[PDB]
Design a protein around this ligand. Structure first.
Ligand SMILES: C[C@H](CCC(=O)NCCC[N+](C)(C)CCCS(=O)(=O)[O-])[C@H]1CC[C@H]2[C@@H]3[C@H](O)C[C@@H]4C[C@H](O)CC[C@]4(C)[C@H]3C[C@H](O)[C@]12C
Ligand SMILES: C[C@H](CCC(=O)NCCC[N+](C)(C)CCCS(=O)(=O)[O-])[C@H]1CC[C@H]2[C@@H]3[C@H](O)C[C@@H]4C[C@H](O)CC[C@]4(C)[C@H]3C[C@H](O)[C@]12C
Ligand SMILES: C[C@H](CCC(=O)NCCC[N+](C)(C)CCCS(=O)(=O)[O-])[C@H]1CC[C@H]2[C@@H]3[C@H](O)C[C@@H]4C[C@H](O)CC[C@]4(C)[C@H]3C[C@H](O)[C@]12C
Ligand SMILES: C[C@H](CCC(=O)NCCC[N+](C)(C)CCCS(=O)(=O)[O-])[C@H]1CC[C@H]2[C@@H]3[C@H](O)C[C@@H]4C[C@H](O)CC[C@]4(C)[C@H]3C[C@H](O)[C@]12C
Ligand SMILES: C[C@H](CCC(=O)NCCC[N+](C)(C)CCCS(=O)(=O)[O-])[C@H]1CC[C@H]2[C@@H]3[C@H](O)C[C@@H]4C[C@H](O)CC[C@]4(C)[C@H]3C[C@H](O)[C@]12C
Ligand SMILES: Nc1ncnc2c1ncn2[C@@H]1O[C@H](CSCC[C@H](N)C(=O)O)[C@@H](O)[C@H]1O
Ligand code: SF4
Ligand SMILES: [Cl-]
Ligand SMILES: [Cl-]
Ligand SMILES: [Cl-]
Length: 332
């Protein structure tokens, strides 16, 4: 029964069948025990602080054509935007004035900025003594070099799916082979690396998720970003089925059990498909929240998927997460 799989997880007996079983069992008692276990493992290793890492989505211009993503280059209806370096810096400064100690710079793959514009922004943002995390997709090692020289500390590059065939199909411009290489180049260059994948992708199976789990535990990532697949109306997957919240929550919990030292965000996608989804995820293994500091009107134009916090004032949302972290009994 579920008790058997549970004890192997406590003994850290992580094998392909144990995780497949764990992901397969849909008994309410087993699920709730799994989350309680991950909540306790979270509390033990990373404590009660919920890291608040503000993110700025400074460009929705992308060169790739990912089938799931609304920023794919074939999305013609989406209005495109680019923030100026002055706008990104004064925005990060505002986030630091509100208490952010990490600045996450994310965009579609927009060549306009690469690589010297990113370096200048990073150099400026690093003058405030905060960690800078980049999430800019796949670029040459030479580009990763310069950004590390500019003061960059962390890089986010979700592996999306550890199935090479499912990867190539969903991301035509590249492969899991290249994606895995970019991750290894970053760890090699001294970056703190974040991986992760989507749950509920079309054609994704329980075995794929176990592969995602095994891939994660193998490379022992500093950070892991996990979210449900949300179909975008202007994409080749507009009518596929969204990722399941409970199943995605189990991927978070098992990630916490497998990587008890890792920083695991409570992604916005989780709060999008279930009201209060992020709060739930923070109590099942997650210990990071990434408030959106992208200013209007660009924020509504950054549609990886259709989205929360879209009407709230550009500020306003950091005091919201601090309130949320408080009502959860955690610290910021
Ligand atoms: C235990 C009490 C009622 C007992 C009673 O009426 N006395 C029931 C009544 C409404 C229940 C919640 C909701 O149903 C939604 C959800 C269903 C899940 O299954 C379990 C979790 C959750 C949050 C429930 C928790 C709890 O179970 C509640 C408070
Ligand atoms: C709030 C509800 C219902 C609580 C409830 O209704 N329980 C009875 C109250 C007990 N009292 C103290 C009042 C004394 C009993 C006398 S009384 O007769 O009034 O029940 C409980 C029931 C199941 C609980 C979740 C699951 O575990 C999974 C997971 C474990 C993590 O770790 C923490 C997060 C999460 C999502 C949990 C959150 C929360 O915790 C839930 C929803
Ligand atoms: C931007 C303005 C003007 C003054 C200013 O520009 N201040 C820079 C602060 C920079 N830091 C955060 C690094 C200082 C930390 C001091 S600390 O005591 O944490 O060491 C200052 C004045 C009052 C400040 C808010 C309140 O206070 C309440 C709350 C405290 C949290 O914490 C962070 C969030 C929040 C909402 C604050 C945000 C921001 O800050 C405010 C708006
Ligand atoms: C009530 C809402 C859906 C709203 C709706 O559509 N009505 C449903 C959708 C997903 C559900 C949660 C997940 O299942 C995970 C977990 C399983 C535990 O067993 C009970 C607690 C918890 C947090 C569930 C609570 C509740 O049940 C949720 C939020
Ligand atoms: C005015 C705003 C809204 C309220 C709602 C939640 C409040 C913060 C949280 O409680 C976290 C934290 C607890 C410390 O103890 C005191 C400082 C701090 C930053 C609080 C400051 C401020 O009061 C907040 C932002
Ligand atoms: N439709 C969707 N549903 C859920 N997550 C999505 C999504 N579309 C994109 N994402 C997630 O959003 C993340 C940021 S994509 C932005 C950075 C860069 N272009 C890159 O691809 O890495 C991706 O890793 C992906 O996992
Ligand atoms: S996931 Fe990233 S690289 Fe792929 S289309 Fe979206 S923004 Fe571009
Ligand atoms: Cl931090
Ligand atoms: Cl980060
Ligand atoms: Cl997200």
């Amino acid at each position: 029964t579920g008790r058997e799989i549970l004890e192997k997880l406590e003994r850290r007996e992580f094998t392909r069948e144990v995780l497949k079983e764990a992901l397969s069992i849909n008994d309410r008692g087993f699920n709730e025990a799994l989350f309680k276990l991950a909540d306790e493992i979270r509390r033990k290793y990373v404590g009660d602080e919920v890291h608040i890492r503000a993110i700025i989505e400074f460009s929705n211009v992308c060169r790739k054509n990912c089938l799931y993503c609304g920023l794919r280059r074939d999305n013609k209806n989406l209005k495109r935007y680019r923030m100026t370096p002055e706008e990104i810096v004064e925005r990060a400064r505002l986030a630091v004035q509100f208490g952010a100690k990490t600045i996450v710079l994310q965009s579609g793959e927009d060549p306009y900025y690469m690589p010297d514009v990113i370096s200048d922004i990073v150099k400026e943002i690093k003058k405030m003594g905060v960690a800078v995390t980049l999430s800019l997709g796949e670029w040459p090692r030479e580009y990763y070099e310069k950004w590390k020289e500019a003061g960059a500390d962390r890089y986010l590059l979700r592996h999306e799916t550890a199935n090479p065939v499912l990867h190539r199909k969903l991301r035509p411009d590249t492969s899991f082979e290249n994606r895995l290489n970019c991750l290894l180049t970053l760890k090699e260059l001294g970056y703190e690396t974040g991986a992760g994948s989507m749950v509920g992708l079309p054609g994704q199976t329980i075995d794929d998720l176990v592969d995602d789990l095994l891939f994660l535990k193998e490379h022992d990532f500093d950070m892991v970003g996990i979210g449900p697949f949300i179909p975008h109306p202007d994409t080749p997957l507009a009518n596929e089925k969204k990722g399941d919240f409970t199943l995605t929550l189990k991927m978070v919990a098992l990630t916490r059990i497998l990587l008890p030292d890792s920083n695991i965000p409570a992604t916005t996608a989780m709060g999008t498909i279930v009201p209060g989804g992020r709060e739930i995820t923070l109590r099942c293994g997650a210990n990071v929240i990434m408030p959106n500091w992208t200013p209007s009107p660009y924020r509504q134009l950054y549609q990886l998927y259709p989205g929360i916090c879209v009407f709230e004032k550009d500020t306003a949302c950091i005091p919201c997460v601090m309130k949320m972290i408080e009502l959860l009994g955690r610290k910021p």
